[PDB]
Amino acid sequence: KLHKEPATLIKAIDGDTVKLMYKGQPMTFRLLLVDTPETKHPKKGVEKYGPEASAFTKKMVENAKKIEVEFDKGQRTDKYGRGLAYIYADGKMVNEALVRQGLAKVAYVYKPNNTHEQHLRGKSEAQAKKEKLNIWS
């Protein structure tokens, strides 16, 4: 029952937050189930691998032919008005790619928006951990 819908990139902001045109409306999207390191907020500062995660997401969405968003089963926006979705760049989930590279942690799992939680934890993050990649080094 989850389905992918088209969207158009407006601009990548950091590793886990991107602005997209979705159904004619400009919106900020925040990637479900992950957290890339901080690059903007003063209380946190530039966290290690924050710049790298931002560069990674920007490259991925900017070089994509097709961007798709897939909402989960619960809330579609968070308290800041950001769309909560799994985002796909030519069919590759950016959320998963970041976790697989050790550039993001599985975080903020709020049910019922947890459909891909087991794959992201058990496969992608577990593998990044085993390889000691980037945040896991």
Binding interface with Ca ion (CB under 5 A)? 16, 35-36
Strand partners, 106: 34
Q: Which of 52, 82, 100, 125 is catalytic?
A: 82
Is 82 part of the annotated catalytic residue set?
A: yes
Judged by beta carbon distances under 5 to 8 A according to partner kind, the member of Ca ion, ligand THP, none in contact with residue 114 is none
Q: Vertex 61, ends 58 and 62: CA angle to 5°?
A: 75
- Residue ranges in contact with ligand THP by CB under 6 A: 16-17, 30, 32, 35, 78-79, 84, 108, 110, 113
| Residue 39 site contact among Ca ion, ligand THP, none (CB < 5 to 8 Å, cut-off depends on kind) | none
121 is catalytic: no
Binding site partner of 108, from Ca ion, ligand THP, none, Cβ cut-off 5-8 A by kind: ligand THP
* C-alpha torsion angle, residues 15, 96, 85, 1 (rounded to 10): 170
- Active site (catalytic) residues: 30, 38, 82
